[PDB]
């Protein structure tokens, strides 16, 4: 198996989150990845439907930051 | 002054990078911010043309990661 993002070797699977899990559609992980990358994340994929914790930590940390920035910008734009 | 991203109080300016600097246009900082956020970063801005190191560390760390991911995806998509 391979990490969908970094495409590096997956050791087993307990370094990894499943992007999708069986009778999939709707993931949260997929939704976050779609927000920050230019390619698509879909149930099928010849590539992979797993992401290593190393990539997920970087994406989720950035997303948490990104969400804080959106909130500050929203408040500023809606205040006199 | 205020951080263009988090809109929090700028202490002085040595916690901050100038997004733009005098006879501006072309920044690298602006270019990276434009890649990861939904609003525009421009010389004028009623808002601010400075970014605190706290925000810049988060953006630049993510961007470095993002660049590594693009490279892996490019190689995969161009290899048999
Ligand atoms: Zn990875
Ligand atoms: Zn900031």
Q: Are the CB atoms for B46 and B17 separated by under 8 Å?
A: no
H/E stretch holding A52: strand A50-52
Rounded to a whole number of angstroms, the distance from the CA of B37 to the nearest CA of chain A is 8
Known binder of ligand: residue A16? no
Query: Torsions phi, psi of A47, nearest 5?
Result: -80, -70
Query: Which technique was used to obtain these atomic coordinates?
Result: X-ray
Find the A34 Cα to ligand 1 centroid distance in Å.
Answer: 15
Show contacts of B63-67: CB within 8 Å, 24+ apart. Answer: B63/B32, B63/B35, B63/B36, B65/A55, B65/A58, B65/A59, B65/A62, B66/A36, B66/A37, B66/B35, B66/B36
Cβ of B61 under 8 Å from any chain A Cβ? yes
Query: Does domain A1-80 correspond to CATH entry 3.40.1800.20?
Result: yes
Rounded to a whole number of angstroms, the distance from the CA of A14 to the nearest CA of chain B is 21
Chain A residues 3-32 with CB within 8 Å of chain B: 5-8
Overall resolution, Å: 2.0
């Amino acid at each position: 198996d391979i990490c969908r993002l970094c495409l590096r070797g997956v050791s087993g699977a307990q370094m990894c989150l499943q992007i999708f899990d069986v009778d999939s559609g709707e993931s949260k992980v997929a939704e976050v990845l779609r927000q920050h990358f230019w390619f698509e994340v879909l149930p099928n994929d010849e590539i992979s439907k797993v992401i290593c914790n190393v990539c997920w930590t970087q994406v989720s940390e950035f997303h948490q930051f990104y969400v804080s920035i959106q909130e500050a910008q929203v408040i500023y734009a809606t205040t006199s």
